[PDB]
Amino acid sequence: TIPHLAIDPFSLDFFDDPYPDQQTLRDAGPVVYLDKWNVYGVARYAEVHAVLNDPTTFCSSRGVGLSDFKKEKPWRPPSLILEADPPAHTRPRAVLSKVLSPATMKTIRDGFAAAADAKVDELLQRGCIDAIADLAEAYPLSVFPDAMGLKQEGREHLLPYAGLVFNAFGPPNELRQTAIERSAPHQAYVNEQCQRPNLAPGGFGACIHAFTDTGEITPDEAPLLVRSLLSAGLDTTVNGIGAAVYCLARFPGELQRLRSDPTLARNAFEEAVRFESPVQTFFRTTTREVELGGAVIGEGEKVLMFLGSANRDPRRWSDPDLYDITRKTSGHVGFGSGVHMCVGQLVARLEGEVMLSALARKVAAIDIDGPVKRRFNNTLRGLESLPVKLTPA
């Protein structure tokens, strides 16, 4: 028998304080039934991690949101990559993997680091900044669209585009309804920047499009792959970075450790990703009857994975509720795991690294000073505003 719970993990109350209810999702049993949305979920590390690693049994091609693409109409034409199963996923995955290769990262590290240092310098002149608008938002908007090869005009549509994409994986609540009602201009902006003549030479977009010349992909597939990175590749990194700064604001000890060995920057970032888990949840759909956590679940059933919970499971993590910048963070699910593991993880790490490295060197203290405000989203977890005073080194 599977435990029934009344917890609504897509509700404003849940978002505002998820941690008690997350314990209850874990502690009820390895598999629970969410009364509210009529679906099964798993919130322990072990089940979440095992579900990721068996795409044959737990498919994505039926949507990674509540909606089941076999029975219901997708809100937009499905992602080629996020919403496909091997073998179909493989070709496009390989395409995005080359575009975002370690080697590509080497070519862009220095520019990214330069901006990250310039950015921090600038903020110290001001003293009082908002770590979201001025830092977690400004910094990635300052490097990632250029790196994509996007034109100046229309950029304002990127963050709201992401929000919509991420609201849409959820149940049909007001967050979701409202996002879709207001989708058209964002979609029209992105559909236009996905086109070849609009991506600057040598940027991710053009680089994507080059795969059409070799036959690696069709002229039609290219824009839809550009659309993938315009969906997933900004807002996550905004929330990951905001997580990191939020953490070092709350954990002064850890900041001094980081100041003390700036080479901890990359791992300090990884640890914020675990701890806050920017992307909180994703679904899968069973392709057969399957035993998971000791319960038998039938074919064609949606299963909710609580990535952020898994990342806080005391079964897997020593002292899960602590931000610890030397934690062996290897194994966390914040980026997913297995075939679909975040193909953009290296851009994200690069942003996080250099930002935390610049904060490491240039800043001696980071204090919260003001109302912290949360941003509600069906999938993404993060802040709207985090007012901080930065003390210079």
Ligand code: HEM
């Ligand atoms: C802190 C930042 C980020 C986080 C936490 C994050 C999180 C994730 C997670 C959890 C998955 C797994 C999806 C699944 O299993 O169904 C994923 C996949 C994906 N990510 Fe990210 N991501 C981040 C940044 C980025 C960036 C910078 C890009 C691109 C530039 C990106 C693009 C993608 C794409 C295209 C997929 C689909 C991969 C596939 O299905 O093979 N993400 N991401």
Ligand SMILES: [Cl-]
């Ligand atoms: Cl779209």
